[PDB]
Design a protein around this ligand. Structure first.
Ligand SMILES: NS(=O)(=O)c1ccc(C(=O)N2CCc3cc(O)c(O)cc3[C@@H]2c2ccccc2)cc1
Ligand SMILES: [Zn+2]
Length: 257
């Protein structure tokens, strides 16, 4: 029954998921002055040319655009990663206002939203097994700021009306996730966790330095989605982000400078 409301939000999650107060929780604040350039980091490899999107789903806490991951098509490798990670889905976290919405922060700055492209390590066979491993997932995070529209995001924005409430899904084939990437692949990386329950500590986070720009109309449409299901009191899907967690015994490494 976890959610983002006053009575079931992030501050309550620890009661059902004690790992919420663990040693490598996400998101975190990225202190750009403390992050250290790591020359041993190999270049990041995002191969989405053969990506196969299938459906978009409103699951009550965000909307996921799901991909066919039964074959090695859209994969992430290189950077801090050893092995190949297959793209399974992407979703966003956003706010009720342009001044908040991202999960990670940069020098405490909050962006209007944050895109997460979730990938699982093929050496574990499937996603369910991968989430039980410390290096099971790789999530590529991309910040969104409000300004000019993102052409590549419009197809997602226009299908949202068809999945307004929890449990609704719609066919979403042939969507190219390459259209959601910034120009530069410079990034920060650190070991962490899923940012939603079960908050498993199975993620290598790779967060891009360069935000993409989306228009006020694009994010405005995100804020029209609902957390509730059809026929229930309307709860707008906004502020579905978890705040920054203690960094603890971790170092954030930079791929640049
Ligand atoms: N924000 S994030 O760290 O990038 C992230 C990653 C994966 C997942 C995910 O795949 N989850 C967690 C939430 C969730 C909620 C459901 O209703 C559900 O049907 C599945 C999930 C999955 C999940 C569930 C159990 C164990 C691991 C993942 C969600 C968010
Ligand atoms: Zn996420």
């Amino acid at each position: 029954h976890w959610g983002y409301g006053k009575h079931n939000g992030p501050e309550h999650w620890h009661k059902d998921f004690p790992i919420a107060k663990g040693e490598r929780q996400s998101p975190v604040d990225i202190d750009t002055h403390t992050a250290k350039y790591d020359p041993s980091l190999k270049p990041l490899s995002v191969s989405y040319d053969q990506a196969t999107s299938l459906r978009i789903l409103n699951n009550g806490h965000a909307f996921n655009v799901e991909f066919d991951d039964s074959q090695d098509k859209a994969v992430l490798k290189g950077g801090p990663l050893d092995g190949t990670y297959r793209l399974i889905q992407f979703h966003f976290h956003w706010g009720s206002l342009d001044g908040q919405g991202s999960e990670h922060t940069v020098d405490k700055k909050k962006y209007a939203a944050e895109l997460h492209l979730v990938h699982w390590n093929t050496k574990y066979g499937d996603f369910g097994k991968a989430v039980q491993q410390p290096d099971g997932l790789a999530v590529l995070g991309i910040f969104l700021k409000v300004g000019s529209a993102k052409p590549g995001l419009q197809k997602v924005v226009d299908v949202l009306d068809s999945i307004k409430t929890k449990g609704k899904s719609a066919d979403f084939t042939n969507f190219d996730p390459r259209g959601l990437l910034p120009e530069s692949l410079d990034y920060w990386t650190y070991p962490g966790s899923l940012t939603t329950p079960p908050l498993l500590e199975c993620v290598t986070w790779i967060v891009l330095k360069e935000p993409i720009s989306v228009s006020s109309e694009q994010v405005l449409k995100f804020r029209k989605l609902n957390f509730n299901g059809e026929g229930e009191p309307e709860e707008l899907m906004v502020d579905n982000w978890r705040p920054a967690q203690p960094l603890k015994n971790r170092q954030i490494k930079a791929s640049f400078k």
